[PDB]
Amino acid sequence: DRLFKHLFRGYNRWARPVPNTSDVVIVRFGLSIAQLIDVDEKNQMMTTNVWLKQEWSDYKLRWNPTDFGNITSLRVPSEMIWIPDIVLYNNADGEFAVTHMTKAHLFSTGTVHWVPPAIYKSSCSIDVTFFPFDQQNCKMKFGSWTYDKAKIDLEQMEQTVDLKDYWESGEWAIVNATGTYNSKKYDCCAEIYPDVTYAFVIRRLP
Amino acid sequence: EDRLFKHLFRGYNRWARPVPNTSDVVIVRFGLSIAQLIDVDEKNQMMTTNVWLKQEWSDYKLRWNPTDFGNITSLRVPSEMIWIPDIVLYNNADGEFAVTHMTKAHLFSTGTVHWVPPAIYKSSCSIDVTFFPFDQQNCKMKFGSWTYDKAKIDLEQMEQTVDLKDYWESGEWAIVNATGTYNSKKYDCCAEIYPDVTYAFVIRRLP
Amino acid sequence: EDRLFKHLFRGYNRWARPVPNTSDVVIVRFGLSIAQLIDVDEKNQMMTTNVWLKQEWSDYKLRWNPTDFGNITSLRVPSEMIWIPDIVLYNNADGEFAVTHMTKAHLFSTGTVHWVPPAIYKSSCSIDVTFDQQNCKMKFGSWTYDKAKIDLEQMEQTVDLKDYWESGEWAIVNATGTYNSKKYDCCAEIYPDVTYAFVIRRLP
Amino acid sequence: EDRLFKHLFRGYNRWARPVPNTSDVVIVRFGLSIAQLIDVDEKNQMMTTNVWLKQEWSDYKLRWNPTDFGNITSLRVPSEMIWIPDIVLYNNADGEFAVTHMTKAHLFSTGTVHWVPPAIYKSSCSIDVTFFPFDQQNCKMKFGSWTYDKAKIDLEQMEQTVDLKDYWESGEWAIVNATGTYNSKKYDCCAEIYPDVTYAFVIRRLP
Amino acid sequence: EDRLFKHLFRGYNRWARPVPNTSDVVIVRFGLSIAQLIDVDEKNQMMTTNVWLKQEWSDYKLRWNPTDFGNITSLRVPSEMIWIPDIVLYNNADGEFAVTHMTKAHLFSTGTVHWVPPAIYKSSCSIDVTFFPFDQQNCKMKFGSWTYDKAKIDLEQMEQTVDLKDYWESGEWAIVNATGTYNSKKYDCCAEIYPDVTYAFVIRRLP
């Protein structure tokens, strides 16, 4: 019975503690871009509609399908489980994390697939090459806000799962798109925090 | 003797989390009503609408026989209390992705759920040109469940029985004929297959 | 009961979910009060009002005998605790469909509720200025409960909707509310509403 | 005599719902402080103020004797836990309408509460007629309990002794007259009589 | 092998409400880092910033002995679960008071917390312009406890050694000099004395 598996896993659990026997949590992270909504220059910023692909392992979420119902995978609330606190470093002008939220896809293996939608407003830069065919770099910097490389580290979801895959063409381009792993000590706080920053290229399309 | 006796018996056992199923596949008759064309602006590249998402599905866990309640066969229950579909607006949401009100569902003793919340959607579009007073536009709205694939959930388009156009106050521009069509796809992000229904519009002004 | 036993006496068994009666048909007395016309937008063709939603109905379960309590009559309770009507603004609330405040209700031992939430609505109009007329109607109603379950009788617009009206840049010369009943093609039942129609001449 | 232990003593038997007296007529000491004049836009004739609503009242239910505790007394608790005045802005308020924050209150062993939450108010006003200067303006703010009448709740105005302007940073455009004044009315909606304090401001533009 | 062995029992005995001190005066090391200067309006009427409020204080009740943990014992806890300072932006505008996110705190066996939530503040300052590209502006940001005075809580300004500007993103323009300065005052509203740290900025339209 479906309710039988939920109470089994949710019954004891703290979403608060990091999900493993001991260090460290690895998160597969990839950006999908559904639409580049608008970028105005007067504003000097870009508006995007994206999907934040995240998959990680929660051992405390493991179960045996043979035991009840032969249920390999169920869809549970992301509010119920532990999720990584991933923020958009790059100066969201409304909101930093994914606020919708949406359900997570949990597999009997303890593997979580979360893909919430987001509308981000993020600051960009502008190349001057031509008047109409002129260009812009528009970076997007995602990373965990509170967990450092010791506690959480992200493996970049491998640009094979396409940055551009469902992108519906609006007005502008986004020609070269790059994910890049980085790591730093930030001058505030003792630990070193991984990020994946994205570089986009948008050419004014006539 | 009292409806409150039926609230208990229905809610008592229930989990909102699992799809209200027996073994496999929830089906939603899905239909759009349009109250308003609020704004269409070029600057921002979007369209603003006030729509009604009519939804209908059957909840197995929620069936009862009216004789056990009274000569009345339906009560209105909170949409936060029951399982409802995770349907989202794919193309932007500068208001919101899901329906945010959210109103009650009208539950029928047969187990049939009708949920029809109001919504104001801000949805992306490619907005015309100058091209004289006469410039028209497609402006699509793309709906589908976000986490549940076709195995788990599927959408069948209402006969357009929830009327697309009967209650529509004009006030802004056009909506001449607006067309829905079912689709289905795989996305590189998820192994499963997800149905959507996108709705297409046509816009005029008042020349 | 000690002044709190009465909260406890009624709040204890009660459900906010169920329409509050013994049989059928909750009747809600409804009136629109207008405090201010904030703005009427020309380009974007619509009007913004700050209103008071007068609501009155009878909740059976909330009845008591005051003798059993202080002699203090009736009290003010939180609106989230009781059943309140889901009256929504049909008509383009582009900020907000319903009353989002939510202020308290004045509940009487008699089982009578008086709820008057303030609300700020952004509402659609039709053909503006140059002569200069405007439609600017506001359509109110229960969203999920049809006439069978809940129905509205107008606090007469005889009790003036306009007493509190402070005039900004526009008019509101004649504004009249009128009751309707309709079937919508989405839904099999019949749903009553009260539309209030305004006319504003920006009058010099 | 444990500091978190004292909380346990006041909060345990309490309802935020009921007026804190056991008799009649809560008196809330009320005064407006103006920290900043944020913006003045003439088109929509409204004013944006950053204000502090000074409120202090007595909770019968909140007294304790410091001798019985050790750090010892008069500490700050969350404003959500107690009963507080439903004081609202009659005038306009398109962002807040009420305090909507909300801050902590400072509770005194004597049972008296000081709540002083910040607000961003957007409020309407008039330029009046031509012999009032054309670039100067009168701007009123009407504050009061929304659901409680003078019998159940009443306001006594803090004198202009506690300065509206002490925290008033002299901004871009000026403020001259500051007078708050108590009123009471019967409203055609509602049988009772509801006290208010209206504040009337004057603002001249010498740049 | 369980943080819940550790999570539990730390939070278990806890009240978020009372200031976490056996004596008096919890000291918060308080500091700003600037990620981006989003915008300056406008004309009308304000400045927009993307900030990190670096905060550190000591909650003794959050102490545990690390030996009951493997070696380096500090875990990340919900800021919702602990006591956190009520620091607000005094001036604000059409934006928001306090930290509205809000992210996790870094708790040390020492009882020492590191909380550094991101923030988007909209605050004027003063309208500026009047000149051509060469107009300059002084935009201040005043942070401080709202309800807690210096007797109960006080601020030590974090060294500007730990960087204010390192992550300063070019964006649109300016923000060439910043200064933090500690103040303490009596307000005619409130009998005690409330300390603040105000920041003064200078932003030259980037050439």
Ligand SMILES: Clc1ccc([C@H]2C[C@@H]3CC[C@H]2N3)cn1
């Ligand atoms: Cl509790 C905590 C952890 C980390 C941080 C900061 C350090 C890195 C850079 C910004 C954010 N992440 C701030 N607070």
Ligand SMILES: Clc1ccc([C@H]2C[C@@H]3CC[C@H]2N3)cn1
């Ligand atoms: Cl559950 C439900 C019932 C009815 C409806 C709609 C039909 C009537 C008019 C609009 C709204 N009310 C929408 N949802």
Ligand SMILES: Clc1ccc([C@H]2C[C@@H]3CC[C@H]2N3)cn1
């Ligand atoms: Cl948990 C989860 C599963 C699947 C999805 C995806 C399937 C459809 C198309 C994109 C998004 N919605 C997103 N999240």
Ligand SMILES: Clc1ccc([C@H]2C[C@@H]3CC[C@H]2N3)cn1
């Ligand atoms: Cl429950 C209730 C009672 C009274 C009121 C009204 C009385 C004063 C004036 C408007 C509003 N405040 C509104 N709601």
Ligand SMILES: Clc1ccc([C@H]2C[C@@H]3CC[C@H]2N3)cn1
């Ligand atoms: Cl409960 C309370 C006490 C005092 C205060 C005020 C004193 C200083 C200046 C504004 C605010 N901080 C605000 N609230």
